[PDB]
């Protein structure tokens, strides 16, 4: 339960965010360590970033949207999470065994979500308990908790949830399902209305420590401190941009 662990000297504050709450379920070398568990096991992204990023588009490509904004529960065949226009599935509860590394969620600012049983109480088993789970269920904040989450699964692929995104309408089958700010293609698809993950705009994702892991081809990116407002609350946060 409570590691009381004797004493520590300096001026103190609270209990904070624990590491044991990280699901290290990683089936490519298991681990000799923890940094070991994540690199020499799973994320083997070497240099294919030019042609991985090839399958993504500028926002200009997509069909202009008519009329009123709706929400899409389709998410189908859209399977390139490193592109800004990935239309993700709304967040469910994902069992701890399918996660390698920490899970980050975005009230646009990033926060860690830890392992827990199906009744919401934190578990500190490094997610190796079977009943451990990552309860990611989301609702768009000013009221819910976050616009979306990104994490890495047991074979090291990045996978994201959030939203659900917006059906801004469109002319043809070459049409956009907006997971971010879009007021280019439709003048009401802002991040607060359609943002479904870290992607602040088509070309800026929220900087966070495992941004280099989950979205690896944004290494070369430039980091900016930007304000944002989410139903009244001020968010100041770094964005990796290009």
């Amino acid at each position: 339960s409570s590691g009381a662990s004797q004493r520590v000297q300096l001026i103190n504050t609270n209990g904070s965010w624990h590491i044991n709450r990280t699901a290290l379920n990683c089936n490519d070398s298991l681990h000799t360590g923890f940094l070991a568990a994540l690199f020499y096991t799973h994320k083997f992204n070497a240099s294919g970033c030019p042609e991985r990023m090839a399958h993504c588009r500028p926002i200009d490509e997509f069909a202009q949207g008519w009329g009123p904004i709706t929400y899409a529960e389709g998410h189908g065949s859209d399977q390139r999470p490193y592109c800004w226009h990935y239309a993700p599935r709304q967040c469910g509860t994902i069992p701890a065994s399918q996660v390698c590394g920490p899970v980050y969620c975005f009230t646009p600012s990033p926060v860690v979500v830890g392992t827990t049983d199906r009744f919401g109480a934190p578990t500190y088993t490094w997610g190796e308990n079977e009943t451990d789970v990552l309860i990611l269920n989301n609702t768009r904040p000013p009221q819910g908790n976050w616009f979306g989450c990104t994490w890495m699964n047991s074979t090291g692929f990045t996978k994201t949830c959030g939203g659900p995104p917006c059906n801004i309408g469109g002319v043809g089958n070459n049409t956009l399902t907006c997971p971010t700010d879009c007021f280019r293609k439709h003048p009401e698809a802002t991040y607060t209305k359609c943002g479904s993950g870290p992607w602040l705009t088509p070309r800026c994702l929220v900087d966070y420590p495992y941004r280099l892991w989950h979205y690896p081809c944004t290494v070369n990116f430039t980091i900016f401190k930007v304000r944002m407002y989410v139903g009244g609350v001020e968010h100041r946060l770094n964005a990796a941009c290009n």
Partner: antibody
Amino acid sequence: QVQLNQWGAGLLKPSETLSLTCAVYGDAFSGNYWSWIRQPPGKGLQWIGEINHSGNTNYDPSLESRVSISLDTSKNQLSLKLNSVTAADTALYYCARGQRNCSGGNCYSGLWAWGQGTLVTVSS
Amino acid sequence: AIHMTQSPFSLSASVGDRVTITCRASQGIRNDLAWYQHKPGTAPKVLIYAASSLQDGVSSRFSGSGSGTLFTLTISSLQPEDFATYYCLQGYNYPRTFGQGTKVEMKR
């Protein structure tokens, strides 16, 4: 979409103490508040009380005398307890997660995540 | 204690109508108001918070307006799923106080 979970014994006889718990999924974050609501049969929704990110609470002046709400952050569990219960406390008891933010002057509250209810029949 | 009085307590409407329930505050509650939808068997849903904002994925039919002492929920065209009971609720005062609810039945 986020839905909460309520536990607790629902049948009471008068002068016992009703004691529900409610798994608000998710850690306490700044501005978050949690509250309990009851629907006595045939009546409207009725406010019991709130506890927020700070641990301090508004109750209903009717029930302050004998009610209490805590939040055990260790298990992410909300708690409601009604003392000296009367047969009139029979109702359907809801627990709700919500967010209250102040843009300087004005503020808004709202409850976006809810329990399932627990019917509590108090009757001898 | 800020008393909210909600109008009308009952209301019969067809599918297609505009429906405007309202809710008046004894004193000014700024615009800390909130609108909830209650159907027998289910928990309540927030539809509108801050008296005029739409909760994520609550339909465009639902317009919230007003401020001070006088607030409306307005449904654009009534939909079969919309038939429920609606309660307002202010979040400005020491005792949170509801409206009495408006039960919106279907006409036949």
